[PDB]
Design an enzyme around this catalytic site. Structure first.
Site, PDB file in Angstrom:
ATOM      1  N   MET A 103      51.207  16.557  38.790  1.00  0.00           N
ATOM      2  CA  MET A 103      49.907  16.565  39.404  1.00  0.00           C
ATOM      3  C   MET A 103      49.540  16.887  40.890  1.00  0.00           C
ATOM      4  O   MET A 103      50.271  17.512  41.364  1.00  0.00           O
ATOM      5  CB  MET A 103      49.122  15.370  38.722  1.00  0.00           C
ATOM      6  CG  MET A 103      48.935  15.366  37.290  1.00  0.00           C
ATOM      7  SD  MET A 103      48.120  16.927  36.692  1.00  0.00           S
ATOM      8  CE  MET A 103      47.557  16.482  34.872  1.00  0.00           C
ATOM      9  N   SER A 104      48.429  16.157  41.221  1.00  0.00           N
ATOM     10  CA  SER A 104      48.300  16.268  42.677  1.00  0.00           C
ATOM     11  C   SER A 104      49.282  15.766  43.721  1.00  0.00           C
ATOM     12  O   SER A 104      49.200  15.882  45.079  1.00  0.00           O
ATOM     13  CB  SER A 104      46.989  15.733  43.112  1.00  0.00           C
ATOM     14  OG  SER A 104      45.793  16.472  42.530  1.00  0.00           O
ATOM     15  N   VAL A 105      50.312  15.201  43.419  1.00  0.00           N
ATOM     16  CA  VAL A 105      51.543  14.791  44.216  1.00  0.00           C
ATOM     17  C   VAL A 105      51.979  16.081  44.530  1.00  0.00           C
ATOM     18  O   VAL A 105      52.697  16.118  45.776  1.00  0.00           O
ATOM     19  CB  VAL A 105      52.465  13.878  43.541  1.00  0.00           C
ATOM     20  CG1 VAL A 105      53.651  13.856  44.268  1.00  0.00           C
ATOM     21  CG2 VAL A 105      51.977  12.406  43.439  1.00  0.00           C
ATOM     22  N   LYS A 107      50.385  18.466  45.827  1.00  0.00           N
ATOM     23  CA  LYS A 107      49.701  18.733  47.223  1.00  0.00           C
ATOM     24  C   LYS A 107      50.673  18.332  48.482  1.00  0.00           C
ATOM     25  O   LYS A 107      50.899  18.929  49.323  1.00  0.00           O
ATOM     26  CB  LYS A 107      48.691  18.006  47.126  1.00  0.00           C
ATOM     27  CG  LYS A 107      47.294  18.597  46.025  1.00  0.00           C
ATOM     28  CD  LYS A 107      46.185  18.006  46.283  1.00  0.00           C
ATOM     29  CE  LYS A 107      44.918  18.725  45.573  1.00  0.00           C
ATOM     30  NZ  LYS A 107      45.215  18.536  44.146  1.00  0.00           N
ATOM     31  N   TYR A 207      37.933  15.976  48.372  1.00  0.00           N
ATOM     32  CA  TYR A 207      38.948  16.183  47.898  1.00  0.00           C
ATOM     33  C   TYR A 207      38.688  17.443  46.878  1.00  0.00           C
ATOM     34  O   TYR A 207      37.818  17.368  45.911  1.00  0.00           O
ATOM     35  CB  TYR A 207      39.246  15.012  46.904  1.00  0.00           C
ATOM     36  CG  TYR A 207      40.718  15.072  46.276  1.00  0.00           C
ATOM     37  CD1 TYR A 207      41.757  15.555  46.999  1.00  0.00           C
ATOM     38  CD2 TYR A 207      40.886  14.834  45.085  1.00  0.00           C
ATOM     39  CE1 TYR A 207      43.179  15.226  46.654  1.00  0.00           C
ATOM     40  CE2 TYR A 207      42.104  14.873  44.458  1.00  0.00           C
ATOM     41  CZ  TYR A 207      43.250  15.295  45.069  1.00  0.00           C
ATOM     42  OH  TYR A 207      44.441  15.342  44.746  1.00  0.00           O
TER      43      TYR A 207
END
Lengths: 384, 384
Positions: A103-105, A107, A207
């Site tokens: 997921m957003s990790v 990023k 965000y």
């Protein structure tokens, strides 16, 4: 128009192949060796049921750790102290070498690639996004600097109400292939980004996953490499990882940089190890000492107005795709919905990886519990 | 209705998850660990340009072999004599451990799984298809025996004119996810199969990919396992393969048994090795000695009326998802469009794997050239 993009393969025409042309020449030579990039596919195991709990050390200090992990829908958990794996946990049905969506990790991995290019002088964070992606002129990304994208300090009209199909959040997913397309939707992720608008103000943290995909687009324009390849060349291939990572791609082959990466817990920890090693990995330097230092230092505190973060971390901030707690331990972490964390604990030279599947993407409850575990584990690593 | 199908995961509702529900509980626990099954994805290499030619031995007897392989768009080529790899070739851009789509060679793997179940007494080839898949009543598969499916001796109204979207061949692809869906198309592969009709006659060979998918459906009903899992349990996991194989799946998670498997050339050779070893693999017996014997023996010659095959192999036939040349060497082979072959040469106890990407799926020209290479290589292995 979204301009030039890296070809799916050498000499490929724009947007080729598609789900309807991969069997045709000249696309098939490439497609037959990469079909998973075109059609959903399952692994047929070469290997012929119960949770694996090897908490050992910290187990004495945290007796009910396994139960706490179960309560937070933990799939994979790993603690790397220095270069040693000192604690591990994998739910029943999830093997130690299985890959898990970040997921957003994801990023934080993208920001790392950008950092590598900054170190090469290929990207100047002070330059406007349009210096690299002129096609973003007329959008909310017309004016802001690359650094403002990295720090997510751009005001964007981005409806986060997923239940609403008209929301930017759901439209973003459909444009990238994470959900079924609807009539009128942008053709790909690039096009979707060009539709975003804002009031023009910057400086305050907001965000927004679209920011990371703009970073990946910049990476492609500066290197000429598909983001999928840049992620490997500038990061993954230098980690001496056990397995390849994977990343979902949209119809043009553009990797969903903001949240589509999957990898093993142990391999994700190698990214954290690199950060705690001043930016150096086994295969060479990934990012500069300065870049890592700036990540650990945090972003502007005044820009951080997300109470969902500051209620727990009052002096927290965000910079270069990393969340900075600003707590007494100086903890910094990559974070993703449903409980994903690439947590750094510089005090103990440790990295904590927690990959989960909470029923909900986000709730104060889940984060309170998750952060409690990460903080307790970090403290359990302190010299006594 | 197509009846009961193996759940995507333990306790999953019928058809769950879909591209629009995988992020929701309880699907997400499974989906986050298998996202490639839902969304097209690319590999991010853990490894940091030129063709690899190690023809060695046979090179002396076949001086221009590399050129011949290039002329037939060869991607991967491997010769296994006994248990030893005696010749290898990989085009520039294709690594020895890269996986390649098998197309219809996938059918031979499916037939093997069926054979394993016959050996267990779970499937009786003499029984009608409807004994296992009652839902196929009213279709062309209502009446024929499982053996007739295995030998593809069922007359089916199956338009092979791909260019025509109304053709069964293209509709089959769209139903399985190999091509973009059209309004009205069957929801999945199972549904597509139930729409097939024929004049009721049997006994004559008619190559039709739908037959293999019916076999996979039978496998699922008899074992309760998703075909993806059955392929692993009954075959792949017993080969001591270097890498997992992969298989495309439709929206229900049903593997495209007739042609969606991808694997390395070396691993595919392990399937051939098992056949030449009487059905035994390193991990245990896969199929009975009798099953292998029947495959090598061939099918009824009178049923084989495909001139595309008999012009080259006059005494050829087809049985249990394998093409039997009936030539002086008793060659048998798995075959797939665009140049895929899992060729068995029992005389020399050798297996020849050739994975290619001809511009065209089929032409007499390509097959003449391809068979010339396979026959020449087989002969080069003879004792002299």
């Amino acid at each position: 128009s979204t301009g030039q993009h890296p070809a799916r393969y050498p000499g490929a025409a724009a947007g080729e192949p598609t789900l309807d042309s991969w069997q045709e020449p000249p696309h098939n030579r490439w497609a037959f060796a990469h079909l998973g990039e075109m059609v959903p596919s399952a692994a047929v195991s070469r290997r012929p049921g119960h949770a694996l709990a090897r908490l050992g050390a910290i187990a004495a200090q945290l007796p009910d750790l396994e139960q706490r992990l179960e309560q937070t829908y933990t799939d994979a958990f790993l603690v790397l102290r220095g270069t040693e794996v000192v604690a591990e946990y994998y739910r029943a049905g999830f093997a130690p070498d299985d890959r898990h969506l970040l997921m957003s990790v994801s990023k934080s991995l993208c920001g790392t690639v950008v950092g590598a290019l900054v170190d090469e002088g290929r990207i100047d964070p002070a330059q406007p996004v349009t210096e690299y992606v002129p096609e973003l002129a007329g959008s909310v990304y017309d004016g802001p600097s690359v650094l403002q994208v990295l720090d997510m300090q751009i005001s964007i009209d981005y409806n986060e109400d997923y239940v609403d199909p008209a929301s930017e959040v759901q439209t973003h997913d459909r444009s990238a292939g994470w959900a079924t397309r609807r009539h009128g939707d942008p053709a790909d992720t690039y096009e979707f980004l060009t539709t975003l608008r804002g009031d023009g103000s910057t400086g305050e943290f907001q965000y927004c996953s679209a920011n990371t995909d703009v970073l990946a687009w910049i990476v492609e324009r500066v290197t000429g490499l598909r983001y999928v390849e840049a992620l490997s060349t500038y990061l993954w291939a230098k980690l001496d990882a056990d397995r390849d990572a994977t990343i979902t791609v949209d119809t043009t082959g553009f990797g969903f940089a903001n949240g589509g990466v999957s990898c093993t817990a142990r391999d994700l920890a190698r990214v954290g190890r690199m950060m705690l090693d001043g930016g150096v990995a086994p295969g060479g330097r990934v990012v500069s000492e300065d870049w890592v230092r700036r990540v650990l230092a945090g972003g502007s505190h005044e820009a951080m107005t997300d109470k969902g973060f500051t209620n727990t971390f009052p002096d927290g901030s965000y910079t270069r795709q990393w969340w900075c707690t600003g707590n007494e331990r100086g903890n910094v972490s990559g974070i993703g919905i449903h409980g994903q964390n690439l947590w750094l604990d510089p005090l103990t030279d440790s990295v904590i990886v927690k990959l989960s599947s909470w029923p909900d993407p986000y709730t104060e409850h889940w984060h309170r519990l998750q952060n409690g575990i990460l903080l307790d584990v970090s403290r359990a690593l302190d010299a006594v």
